[PDB]
């Protein structure tokens, strides 16, 4: 069964990779994000009749009333970086079984890159396993954040205190900020105003790479994908060592 | 000139291979002289004449002068290669008599190479490019970058310009330019860059159709010479040059 779940999973993004490069340097952008969700659920459901999925294109799909499997799906998270010709967006997909993320891919299908976070193993890049690096000291620290994504202004004020704090503070971009985290080339990540296909799949990368990744306050990021479920927005933060994530959450004051 | 070209496109080639080699394994300062190194071999060993001019030595030539100089940046984006973001780039510009006749973005890892020369249209991977029209600069997408030596006014004036656009977007070194270039992007604006972070994108940007000038509107300019100081520049590039006016008056420099 768990195998056979990844070995969907790779069949999906594989066909959201193949629809993303009909389009991508050629609205292009809603088409592609449309065609490529299709794609996705198209492979999923021939596999798994009895799963449910949550697109970021067309919301909760389900031919029952409910679901122990549910597929929560961005196939380009990063439409700016995809209009502007950038190939740093990428598809997400997580897997979720009774709302708990058990598998999550960060698929960039022009880079030929991707990371896969499945429980119970390591997190592998094209198949290689990779870990976050250790990092004692926020002051050390190479950090990604974005503009807050709903304009809040108390969440400019944390973003001001937490690049304050570090070594290097740089742009973020979308997923791929995450997996460099995860393949240990940075060591935190915060972002404001996320909905939860932007987030789910980043959840078994992170955790099964060796990092940690919660809400503002420390806490579980969680979301139960259900057919009354409503996709909200979140903030998030993501380190690879647990000591500079506990700094971070000192630092956001949230 | 072809040869001219030839040459260059070799000292990439030799760049890319040292740099790939460094990337996602200090190791930025090994890669960046190392490239170095390999791209100023392959020049003078076919133009002994010419004189080269990086941020590190600055100036070099085995004469006292030279009507040809070389100015290199074997990586423009440390920040972005330490972090392992292959969106930095190497920069390779030609300048005859103080004026940049060819210019390369190099993407090594990405395989993207973009090539100005004086004469032809700007071309990626063998193929030509052009920047895209833009009605308005209200419906411009733009790149911005922090400034690069902290000046209060210049984020004013970044405040200004992105407070018009349509895409507001952060920018990443080069990379920026050579998306302009492709006419993915309308307008990329930075403060603080030294010529040899910018000599390169003159060709490139020119040659696609696209205008590239100092803040006030004025050419960028940068002898490069035995006296010459790497000072620090203001910059905007658009693809059209009706936004590039409107960025100017938005800057207001
Ligand atoms: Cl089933
Ligand atoms: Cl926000
Ligand atoms: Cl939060
Ligand atoms: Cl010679
Ligand atoms: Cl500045
Ligand atoms: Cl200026």
Same mark, same amino acid.
């Given at each position: 069964?768990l195998?056979?779940f990844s070995?969907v999973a790779n069949?999906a993004?594989?066909?959201?990779?193949?629809?993303?490069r009909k389009?991508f340097?050629?609205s292009?952008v809603?088409?592609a994000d449309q065609?490529?969700?299709?794609?996705?659920?198209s492979?999923? !459901?021939?596999?798994?009749?009895?799963?449910?999925?949550?697109?970021?294109?067309?919301?909760w799909?389900?031919?029952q009333?409910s679901?122990?499997?549910?597929?929560?799906?961005?196939?380009?998270?990063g =439409?700016?970086?995809?209009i /502007?010709?950038?190939?740093?967006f990428? =598809?997400?997909?997580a897997?979720?079984? %009774?709302?708990?993320?058990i598998?999550?891919i *960060?698929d960039? &299908?022009?880079?030929?890159?991707?990371?896969?976070?499945?429980?119970?193993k390591? /997190?592998?890049? %094209?198949?290689?396993?990779v870990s @976050?690096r =250790?990092c004692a000291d926020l002051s050390q620290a190479?950090?990604? @954040? /974005?503009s807050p994504?709903?304009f809040?202004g108390?969440a400019?004020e944390?973003? *001001?205190?937490?690049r304050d704090?570090?070594?290097? &503070?740089?742009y973020?971009? +979308?997923c791929?900020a995450?997996?460099l985290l995860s393949?240990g080339f940075? +060591?935190?990540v915060?972002?404001?105003?996320?909905?939860?296909?932007?987030? !789910?799949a980043?959840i078994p990368?992170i955790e099964?790479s060796?990092?940690?990744?919660?809400?503002?306050?420390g806490?579980?990021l969680?979301?139960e994908?259900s057919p009354?479920?409503i996709?909200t927005?979140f903030?998030?933060?993501?380190?690879g060592?647990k000591?500079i994530h506990?700094?971070?959450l000192?630092?956001?004051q949230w």
């Amino acid at each position: 069964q768990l195998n056979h779940f990844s070995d969907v999973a790779n069949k999906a993004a594989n066909a959201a990779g193949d629809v993303i490069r009909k389009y991508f340097r050629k609205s292009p952008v809603t088409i592609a994000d449309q065609s490529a969700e299709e794609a996705m659920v198209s492979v999923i !459901l021939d596999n798994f009749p009895s799963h449910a999925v949550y697109g970021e294109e067309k919301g909760w799909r389900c031919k029952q009333d409910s679901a122990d499997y549910v597929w929560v799906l961005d196939p380009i998270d990063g =439409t700016k970086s995809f209009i /502007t010709g950038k190939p740093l967006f990428g =598809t997400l997909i997580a897997l979720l079984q %009774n709302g708990t993320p058990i598998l999550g891919i *960060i698929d960039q &299908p022009v880079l030929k890159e991707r990371w896969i976070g499945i429980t119970g193993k390591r /997190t592998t890049l %094209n198949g290689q396993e990779v870990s @976050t690096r =250790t990092c004692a000291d926020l002051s050390q620290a190479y950090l990604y @954040t /974005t503009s807050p994504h709903l304009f809040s202004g108390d969440a400019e004020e944390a973003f *001001i205190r937490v690049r304050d704090k570090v070594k290097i &503070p740089l742009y973020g971009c +979308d997923c791929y900020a995450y997996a460099l985290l995860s393949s240990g080339f940075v +060591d935190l990540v915060v972002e404001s105003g996320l909905k939860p296909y932007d987030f !789910l799949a980043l959840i078994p990368v992170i955790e099964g790479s060796g990092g940690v990744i919660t809400d503002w306050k420390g806490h579980q990021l969680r979301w139960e994908a259900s057919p009354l479920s409503i996709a909200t927005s979140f903030n998030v933060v993501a380190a690879g060592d647990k000591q500079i994530h506990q700094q971070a959450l000192d630092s956001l004051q949230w």
